[PDB]
């Protein structure tokens, strides 16, 4: 049995840490809902 418990409000944080790049990737989505690189 799964259960849920609240973890926070959904709000933008002005002091947020920033990371991650922004790749452009060619992908395909199969009938299983899985992405694969093309």
């Amino acid at each position: 049995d799964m259960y849920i418990e609240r973890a926070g409000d959904i709000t933008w944080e002005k002091d947020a840490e920033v990371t991650g790049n922004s790749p452009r990737l060619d992908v395909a989505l199969d009938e299983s809902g899985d992405f694969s690189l093309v």
Partner: protein, 154 residues
């Protein structure tokens, strides 16, 4: 509890309590990714949440009503992943999305790598609207992760 916000999805079928994912409560509907719950019913305190809509191909599922979240990335601005990792406090992480280019169009993606139980955490725009959920993506060359910004249709 039906207050709007982000929620951990927990199970007891394994050792301890285990966070299997995350989801969003908005307008009395709970939103998560399909692979988190596989469509099973959820408990919320003494009340039960039954699935209402889902789609394996989108990897999405909603409980107690139809999918409510309809904001979308603007294609230009940074966003925040509100990551809720297992056993750790919710934390906002800002990033500029990349793009999944597919035969049927393009989809924002975020190059952020968190534990598997972080699946379903919301990605927000600068207005605080949920533009999609984290956790369905691909593993790139170096071995790290890029998640689609997965949004449903309201």
């Amino acid at each position: 509890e039906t207050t709007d916000g982000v929620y951990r999805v927990m199970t007891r079928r394994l050792l301890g309590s285990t966070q299997v994912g995350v989801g969003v409560m908005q307008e009395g509907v709970f939103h998560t990714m399909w692979h988190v719950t596989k469509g099973a019913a959820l408990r919320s305190g003494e009340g039960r949440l039954d699935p209402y809509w889902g789609d394996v191909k989108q990897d999405l599922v909603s409980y107690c009503g139809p999918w409510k979240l309809d904001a979308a990335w603007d294609g230009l601005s940074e966003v925040q992943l509100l990551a809720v990792p297992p056993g750790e406090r919710a934390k906002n992480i800002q990033t500029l999305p990349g793009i999944f280019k597919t035969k049927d169009g393009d989809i924002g993606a975020v190059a952020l790598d968190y534990p598997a139980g972080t699946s379903g955490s919301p990605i927000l725009d600068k207005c605080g609207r949920v533009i999609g959920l984290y956790g369905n993506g691909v593993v790139i060359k170096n071995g790290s992760y890029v998640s689609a910004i997965t949004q449903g249709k309201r």
